[PDB]
Design a protein around this ligand. Structure first.
Ligand SMILES: CCCCCCCCCCCCCC(=O)OC[C@H](COP(=O)(O)OCC[N+](C)(C)C)OC(=O)CCCCCCCCCCCCC
Ligand SMILES: CCCCCCCCCCCCCC(=O)OC[C@H](COP(=O)(O)OCC[N+](C)(C)C)OC(=O)CCCCCCCCCCCCC
Ligand SMILES: CCCCCCCCCCCCCC(=O)OC[C@H](COP(=O)(O)OCC[N+](C)(C)C)OC(=O)CCCCCCCCCCCCC
Ligand SMILES: CCCCCCCCCCCCCC(=O)OC[C@H](COP(=O)(O)OCC[N+](C)(C)C)OC(=O)CCCCCCCCCCCCC
Ligand SMILES: CCCCCCCCCCCCCC(=O)OC[C@H](COP(=O)(O)OCC[N+](C)(C)C)OC(=O)CCCCCCCCCCCCC
Ligand SMILES: CCCCCCCCCCCCCC(=O)OC[C@H](COP(=O)(O)OCC[N+](C)(C)C)OC(=O)CCCCCCCCCCCCC
Ligand SMILES: CCCCCCCCCCCCCC(=O)OC[C@H](COP(=O)(O)OCC[N+](C)(C)C)OC(=O)CCCCCCCCCCCCC
Ligand SMILES: CCCCCCCCCCCCCC(=O)OC[C@H](COP(=O)(O)OCC[N+](C)(C)C)OC(=O)CCCCCCCCCCCCC
Ligand SMILES: C[C@H](CCC(=O)NCCC[N+](C)(C)C[C@H](O)CS(=O)(=O)O)[C@H]1CC[C@H]2[C@@H]3[C@H](O)C[C@@H]4C[C@H](O)CC[C@]4(C)[C@H]3C[C@H](O)[C@]12C
Ligand SMILES: C[C@H](CCC(=O)NCCC[N+](C)(C)C[C@H](O)CS(=O)(=O)O)[C@H]1CC[C@H]2[C@@H]3[C@H](O)C[C@@H]4C[C@H](O)CC[C@]4(C)[C@H]3C[C@H](O)[C@]12C
Ligand SMILES: C[C@H](CCC(=O)NCCC[N+](C)(C)C[C@H](O)CS(=O)(=O)O)[C@H]1CC[C@H]2[C@@H]3[C@H](O)C[C@@H]4C[C@H](O)CC[C@]4(C)[C@H]3C[C@H](O)[C@]12C
Ligand SMILES: C[C@H](CCC(=O)NCCC[N+](C)(C)C[C@H](O)CS(=O)(=O)O)[C@H]1CC[C@H]2[C@@H]3[C@H](O)C[C@@H]4C[C@H](O)CC[C@]4(C)[C@H]3C[C@H](O)[C@]12C
Ligand SMILES: CCCCCCCCCCCCO[C@@H]1O[C@H](CO)[C@@H](O[C@H]2O[C@H](CO)[C@@H](O)[C@H](O)[C@H]2O)[C@H](O)[C@H]1O
Ligand SMILES: CCCCCCCCCCCCO[C@@H]1O[C@H](CO)[C@@H](O[C@H]2O[C@H](CO)[C@@H](O)[C@H](O)[C@H]2O)[C@H](O)[C@H]1O
Ligand SMILES: [Ca+2]
Ligand SMILES: [Ca+2]
Ligand SMILES: [Ca+2]
Ligand SMILES: [Ca+2]
Ligand SMILES: [Ca+2]
Lengths: 227, 227, 227, 227
């Protein structure tokens, strides 16, 4: 087509720097809205601000959808950028409260826009694929010990191991090692005195696996450097 | 001998993929049996399912024992695969309850069958042999401090250090650092005010050794790469 | 100018070794002043000692400012060395109590003077610049989860998430993993039973990011060695 | 001189393997003596055993001192081997109870005798010298924050920060992160609401330094391999 003009504006630096400025202003706005006193004083300016920024972001997404239609929905950053826009597009009384809490995720658009942020985030995602083998191992391991722990402690201890889900949680807690013994294992042993046969091996296996996953991360990082 | 036929079926992909499907179905079954309501509704279909799958697995192990007899009992994956089959072969009322909880280990047959899982598990086992020197060091160290801590705190504090085993446990807990001070050392110091001479050095030695073991894992991994 | 004499004294070893000896004597002095009994016995000798050492340090800084004026205020070690001198130069009744507690920082002048200490400290500072990308990521992440957690739990749980700052703190605590579950998440779930959807993902993201930052430190260290 | 005979016996394998067997027998003995029931049954055989083994070890040390006099007291393994022998040589009623608890250290003679154990222990000691710079840094840092924390919280909180030593301990506890917040910082903030300015930076500095020390261990290990 002005199509060259609108694609030289959308891909212009000033357009994306401007929506960056709008993102930062909105983040401060969202920070201030937690103050109940600030919300008694300037509750109207901020909400009108939120409305004007949501409309700007929606037209900005419409333009970005136009200038490169096929890529926009095959590109992860813009896909997410479209989804957080959409989630906050549904009016706050049109959705459940949880939708209004998710609206906060619209600040990650700062990670979307800032290219140093893009670089680092896709670096962490890049780490993820090697870990799949040991994540699959470990979630099978957690499933098995959830099952055994439910069937072993979930009547005398229905608070912690009564369910499969409760056992998943208490096992994750034991894995992070928080309160693993004065909190879970010792009270257990007040009734089942060989409960440490279940948990001490569990601790050993889970910690060994975690260490090895970390070392794995490290060598995958280093191989691209020694080459 | 059909011996070529049965060894072209046992070593066929479909046979092992089928027992993989059976393993997954059984894992979901075992997951559902923890629900007491599901067990009131469909307690019979699942138990008949468990019986038909245990017979399939037992004939599958019999065939696998036949086609390569000598290797089957000199191969770790199949050895374990035989043992978990056997453990759940003993009827649930023929054994103690703990046997029924061990039956859950039959889901690790998924690690046995899936070759990506085999690769990663034998990778972790491969890590293990280098660690033997420092494991032997450390268990001697734990034995010595168990002994000293029992003889030092196990009358005024029989809950935690009254025995050698109780001291082993409380020392392992202090090693994982859980509640090491507000939980153990400080209550101790209410009666023995120099108890930190025992535990602070213990903490230092045990943490230093743990770090060094991890670094050791790392360099053993890296040497095979710089070569 | 004696200017050559005073610059051959300031840059002399004995001058800086002497202020090192004075720094150590002052550190022991500061250690002793916490004893209330020692302060009843020799409260006067130590305070006169503090006054004579502060005057020596102030003239030492005046000389060092003279011999190389332009560099002194463009050099970090001496800049800090000037600032800790100044902070304790304000009389103890001229400032708030917090100023008297900051006076203790005058012992880091030992890190300033000792060159092995300088080497190691600037080594740690040298590590810092690479971490900026992931620190910026993470503080955005903490800001977002502070906001969501305040809006989600800060009425039923005003102690922990009532404010943005309180939520920052409780989230940092959950990040260090201290008491994350028996302390925060479980009491929460007594009222909001899906609170683990908020915290378990938070734990996962924050731990993964921390691991990756550490690995990043490591590879940055190693690249200067494989080269 | 038989001097060749006694030096071909002392340096014989059988002599050192025999004292290894004696060390293991004594370790089991020491383990059994914690049982009060075993001590009612066989309290005499074990004590006579302890006496016969202590005499064997003392003559063994006398022989080892003879065959190479100058080296024995310039060699760390044998020096320690001499000292643990001496500590348990003082009769149990001739010393304080703590001496009888130290007698347990005579089991580390197993690390002294076993050469794989020697290899690994001197490997860990070998790691230690590089860490000196950051240990010296850190103990200065701990001294400074002990001082500030005593002067800041040791009247309203004399249990934890009343002394310099108590503050050292509570700071070490905060460093290991155990109960750092629900245990120390939060109760503090009930009276001093900006106590997190002191501890959150302390946590950050101490953790960063710890990470860097570990990375330092790692690169020192790796440089001897890339060479
Ligand atoms: C990216 C991270 C940057 C750094 C983040 C800084 C966060 C600062 C948090 C500290 C603020 C909270 C402390 C505080 O005491 O504030 C009180 C208010 C809420 O209480 P308030 O409503 O004042 O009290 C009500 C009294 N009542 C019930 C009797 C009527 O709470 C407030 O006043 C909230 C103050 C708003 C802080 C907004 C800071 C935004 C930082 C910029 C981040 C933009 C990144 C895109
Ligand atoms: C590939 C990308 C990375 C992703 C990898 C992470 C994989 C996580 C697997 C989680 C699968 C389990 C999820 C699940 O089954 O949810 C169960 C519970 C929910 O409890 P629930 O019963 O809903 O609570 C309601 C309370 N009620 C009924 C009494 C009213 O919720 C929990 O208990 C969840 C607790 C955490 C589970 C962690 C499981 C092991 C993950 C291993 C991660 C690898 C580390 C090396
Ligand atoms: C490998 C890991 C994959 C992901 C694992 C997913 C785990 C999901 C766990 C969450 C389920 C538990 C949550 C929940 O509230 O369920 C309740 C039931 C038990 O309570 P229920 O019997 O319903 O209540 C009794 C009521 N009474 C006493 C008054 C009669 O508890 C249940 O309903 C159990 C539901 C069965 C979940 C089975 C999921 C299997 C995942 C596939 C793994 C196959 C790998 C080979
Ligand atoms: C080579 C492959 C890797 C394997 C390496 C792991 C080595 C583990 C060594 C364990 C040896 C000690 C086992 C033991 O003596 O059991 C004692 C206690 C059992 O307590 P118990 O007295 O049975 O409780 C009954 C209560 N009662 C009598 C009052 C009714 O049970 C416990 O207290 C066990 C607590 C954990 C002990 C950890 C010992 C140090 C292991 C160092 C691991 C290396 C880390 C760097
Ligand atoms: C760099 C680190 C080196 C190693 C640091 C060593 C730190 C030693 C801390 C242990 C001392 C505290 C233990 C203790 O019980 O001392 C008590 C006094 C305070 O209580 P005190 O005033 O004696 O009791 C009052 C009784 N009343 C209320 C009834 C009248 O508290 C004291 O007596 C304080 C004793 C002063 C220790 C000064 C040590 C300085 C180490 C050298 C560091 C110089 C580096 C530049
Ligand atoms: C580049 C050099 C390295 C530096 C990187 C560190 C960045 C730290 C960012 C901190 C920004 C947040 C500061 C802030 O907003 O302060 C809020 C609270 C203060 O609570 P406040 O409301 O003042 O308490 C008064 C109580 N009242 C009102 C009821 C009377 O104070 C807190 O809650 C602070 C708690 C710690 C916050 C940690 C935030 C995430 C940092 C991520 C660090 C990277 C790790 C991978
Ligand atoms: C290097 C590490 C190897 C593995 C270490 C194995 C450690 C085993 C610890 C578990 C034993 C303790 C469990 C237990 O219930 O034993 C009870 C006794 C003490 O209570 P007891 O005196 O039986 O009860 C008194 C009853 N009363 C007051 C009413 C008269 O406590 C005992 O019976 C103690 C049993 C002695 C265990 C000796 C094991 C030595 C392992 C070999 C290490 C040699 C390395 C050089
Ligand atoms: C080169 C080879 C490696 C060695 C490096 C380790 C360096 C350790 C430095 C320790 C210096 C401080 C020792 C000290 O001053 O002792 C003070 C307290 C003793 O408390 P105390 O006042 O005796 O308790 C009596 C109670 N009373 C008076 C009320 C009846 O006892 C404590 O509080 C000690 C707590 C641990 C202190 C840790 C200090 C920082 C060490 C940094 C280690 C490096 C890690 C990166
Ligand atoms: C990233 C990795 C390949 C890249 C590579 O270099 N391989 C070596 C790493 C090992 C990919 C490619 C093939 C992937 C697995 C298979 O789809 C199925 C398998 C089923 C299990 O039930 C649990 C998931 C498993 C482990 C999968 C995830 C894993 O992430 C693998 C190994
Ligand atoms: C894996 C390792 C060798 C492989 C290698 O490359 N060596 C260098 C690693 C050191 C193997 C081979 C020889 C093994 C030791 C001896 O049998 C006895 C010894 C007795 C102690 O009481 C405790 C166990 C000790 C440490 C054993 C375990 C250890 O695991 C060693 C070193
Ligand atoms: C040390 C690093 C460059 C050195 C290097 O080798 N680069 C590769 C490392 C990535 C420096 C140079 C440019 C720096 C960033 C930009 O100023 C802005 C950016 C804005 C975000 O909102 C948060 C801060 C970000 C990430 C900054 C900090 C970061 O520390 C960068 C990457
Ligand atoms: C192992 C290390 C040298 C080996 C090396 O390769 N150097 C580079 C490592 C840095 C040795 C040799 C010189 C040692 C220091 C000085 O005696 C004094 C100094 C005084 C401080 O108040 C605290 C102790 C300091 C840091 C000492 C310990 C440290 O351990 C050093 C650096
Ligand atoms: C079959 C598996 C073989 C068994 C061997 C595997 C090793 C398992 C060790 C036991 C696990 C307990 O794990 C426990 O975790 C805590 C976490 O605070 C460690 O505390 C840690 O401090 C520092 C700082 O992070 C770490 O760098 C270090 O790795 C570790 O010492 C304890 O030192 C460790 O003992
Ligand atoms: C001026 C200094 C610059 C500031 C930057 C330095 C980083 C400091 C991070 C904040 C310190 C809190 O440290 C907190 O320790 C706990 C210990 O369980 C970590 O938990 C850890 O789990 C795994 C398993 O060990 C580690 O490999 C990982 O490094 C870390 O995530 C928390 O994730 C981390 O947040
Ligand atoms: Ca932890
Ligand atoms: Ca821990
Ligand atoms: Ca902990
Ligand atoms: Ca921790
Ligand atoms: Ca810890």
């Amino acid at each position: 087509g002005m199509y060259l003009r609108i694609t030289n504006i959308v891909e212009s630096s000033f357009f994306t720097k401007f929506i960056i400025y709008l993102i930062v202003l909105n983040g401060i706005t969202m920070g201030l809205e937690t103050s109940k006193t600030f919300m008694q004083s300037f509750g109207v300016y901020t909400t009108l601000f939120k409305q004007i920024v949501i409309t700007i972001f929606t037209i900005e997404i419409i333009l970005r959808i136009y200038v490169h239609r096929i890529s926009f929905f095959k590109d992860p950053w813009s896909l997410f950028d479209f989804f957080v826009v959409a989630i906050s597009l549904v009016p706050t009384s049109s959705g459940f409260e949880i939708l209004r809490v998710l609206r906060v995720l619209r600040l990650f658009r700062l990670v979307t826009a800032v290219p140093q942020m893009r670089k680092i985030v896709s670096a962490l995602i890049s780490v993820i694929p090697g870990m799949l083998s040991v994540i699959a191992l470990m979630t099978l391991f957690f499933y098995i010990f959830a099952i055994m722990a439910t069937q072993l402690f979930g009547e005398r201890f229905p608070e912690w191991f009564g369910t499969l889900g409760e056992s998943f949680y208490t096992l994750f807690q034991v894995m992070t090692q928080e309160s693993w013994s004065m909190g879970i294992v010792r009270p257990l042993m007040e009734v089942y005195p060989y409960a440490w046969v279940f948990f001490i091996p569990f601790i050993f296996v889970v910690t060994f696996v975690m260490i090895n996953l970390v070392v794995a991360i490290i060598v995958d990082a280093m191989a691209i450097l020694n080459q």
